[PDB]
Design an enzyme around this catalytic site. Structure first.
Site, short mmCIF file in Angstrom:
data_model
loop_
_atom_site.label_atom_id
_atom_site.label_comp_id
_atom_site.label_asym_id
_atom_site.label_seq_id
_atom_site.Cartn_x
_atom_site.Cartn_y
_atom_site.Cartn_z
N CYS A 1 -9.71 -10.52 38.51
CA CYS A 1 -9.34 -10.68 39.92
C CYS A 1 -8.61 -12.02 40.06
O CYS A 1 -8.94 -13.01 39.38
CB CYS A 1 -10.52 -10.51 40.87
N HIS B 1 -13.37 -12.65 47.77
CA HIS B 1 -14.63 -12.10 47.20
C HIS B 1 -15.17 -13.00 46.08
O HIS B 1 -16.27 -12.70 45.62
CB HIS B 1 -14.48 -10.63 46.86
N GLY C 1 -13.36 -10.06 35.70
CA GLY C 1 -12.83 -11.42 35.50
C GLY C 1 -11.34 -11.50 35.78
O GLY C 1 -10.85 -12.66 35.89
#
Ligand SMILES: Cn1ccc(C(=O)NC[C@@H]2CCCO2)n1
Ligand SMILES: Cn1ccc(C(=O)NC[C@@H]2CCCO2)n1
Lengths: 301, 301
Positions: free
Chosen positions: B145, B41, B143
């Protein structure tokens, strides 16, 4: 979202941990620049620990009696001195992994990360608070002495704790990196009882703010209080008195949530008086006091 | 003595964390050998996230669109592929800090350490469990991830989790390092409800053993039970069924304490039925289920 008991990343401190052996005692040392810091009780037999005279014990020790091993490589000890309850072993090699660092003496209620080590080997990391009775509630087995407590500010490690001993009640006592014990404790195997383990009120309020920020709001009520009224309740429940300094420190969390500090105090007052009624806050059934206002801002920002 | 929620020392993983930027999205990557692993993603706009076609989005991306920064130094991307829900970015430089590592897919009830990172920078470490509903209860801001979950066996890092998303209920979902989500979750901003968050019974019993080892014994009672009787109570309280496999795993703790597993089950049964009555166990007012039998042995040994 989510709120966890979080330690600082331990890498910068892992790079500093060494093994110190004197005679048959092995514990951990902290290697910064060309100095290795360790508990002075490394020089004691368990017999010695009952009534040690450290100056007299140290006379029988030479540089070569302090075996310092960094991983599987031996460091050469070229000097040793006692500063309060720590030994400083001068080695011939600066630790190449020395981070930017300071030595700080923390106040009760301040939190820090511990890197639990055995034989100079990092074994785990957890978050502690200096208790109001100057103990910490750690996890330390035999061999863990010389493990350290620290905070990190960007790239600067502030070392605040070195582990020295366990009280008969299974709580922990240690020094700053100048070798001064927190609280009244001594590096002697004697009767040492801890005082009242009071709750760190400003930390509880910080954590209630963390709870609101993270969607746990059931405990917010319609009430307010005053510092004096709140403090009557705090005293009754063995909570630390809340000062205007504490209110000022909670200002940014107050601002972020729009809940006045004294309104949150009135929530906390009702929780003390009524209990949790089987409910939880941030996955806890008791009021958590080992997050500082600074910890909550850090984790929430 | 003392029992703490302990993470693995994070240094070996800190050495692997990098920043990955694609267009305007920045998150974390894991740099092992000459591959950087990150959530796929990274290629999505927040708009994309509502119904992303990852294969179609990825066609518009070239190696040079993936900006990979290790500290303040840029890595050169020479290849990219999608494996399930992760991207593998081939770089021209092997990570010199690559630890011995494995990729493991954990089972629900297994614990691991998370190194929460932002912009490739380690920000904290905490201990998690894979919940029975395949969520974790983390602490992750925007932030975070690509932050990873891991266990360490001496010098070998077993990576088991990469952070991908937060459900509307503020619990967390992610993948193993092959990019397969734990549980039914998808990397799409859609309705994804978690199932029952049941209690990890074998972990609670481990932690009751930890409590006994550490002097907290008030909850030990005069009773025993059977697996079938205990399991009737477990079901009623949304505890995972206890199996003979679980009893076998608790054998060493049983041996160490001399408390038969089924006797400890009968203690746990009374705690479920009676509650704590305002008492605590290892500083908790609820039954802790994020220590495995292996964690208790490790910490206690
Ligand atoms: C005491 N301590 C150490 C680390 C933390 C922590 O909360 N880290 C997470 C934050 C989120 C944004 C950047 O770091 N707290
Ligand atoms: C999940 N986890 C990581 C670390 C630990 C832990 O308990 N470390 C302390 C032990 C004591 C003796 C050697 O390490 N648990």
């Amino acid at each position: 979202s989510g709120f966890r008991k979080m330690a600082f990343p331990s890498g910068k401190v892992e790079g500093c941990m060494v093994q110190v052996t004197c005679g048959t005692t092995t514990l951990n040392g902290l290697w910064l620049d060309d100095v290795v810091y360790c508990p002075r009780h490394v020089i004691c037999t368990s017999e010695d620990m009952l009534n040690p005279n450290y100056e007299d014990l140290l006379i029988r020790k030479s540089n070569h009696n302090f075996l310092v091993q960094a991983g599987n490589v031996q460091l050469r000890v070229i000097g040793h001195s006692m500063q309060n309850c720590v030994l400083k072993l001068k080695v011939d090699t600066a630790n190449p992994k020395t981070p930017k660092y300071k030595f700080v003496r923390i106040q009760p209620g301040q939190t820090f990360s511990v890197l639990a080590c055995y034989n100079g080997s990092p074994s785990g990391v957890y978050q502690c608070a200096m208790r109001p009775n100057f103990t910490i509630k750690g996890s330390f087995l035999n061999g863990s002495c010389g493990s350290v407590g620290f905070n990190i500010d960007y790239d600067c490690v502030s070392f605040c704790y070195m582990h020295h001993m366990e009280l008969p009640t299974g709580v922990h006592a240690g020094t700053d990196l100048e070798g001064n014990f927190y609280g009244p404790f001594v590096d002697r195997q004697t009767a040492q009882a801890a005082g009242t383990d009071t709750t760190i009120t400003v930390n509880v309020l910080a954590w209630l703010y963390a709870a609101v920020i993270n969607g746990d709001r059931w405990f917010l009520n319609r009430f307010t209080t005053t510092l004096n009224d709140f403090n009557l309740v705090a005293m009754k429940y063995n909570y630390e008195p809340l000062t205007q300094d504490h209110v000022d420190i909670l200002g940014p969390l107050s601002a972020q949530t729009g809940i006045a500090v004294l309104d949150m105090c009135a929530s906390l007052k009702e929780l003390l008086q009524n209990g949790m009624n089987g409910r939880t806050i941030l996955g806890s059934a008791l009021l958590e006091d080992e997050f500082t206002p600074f910890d909550v801002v850090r984790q929430c920002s």
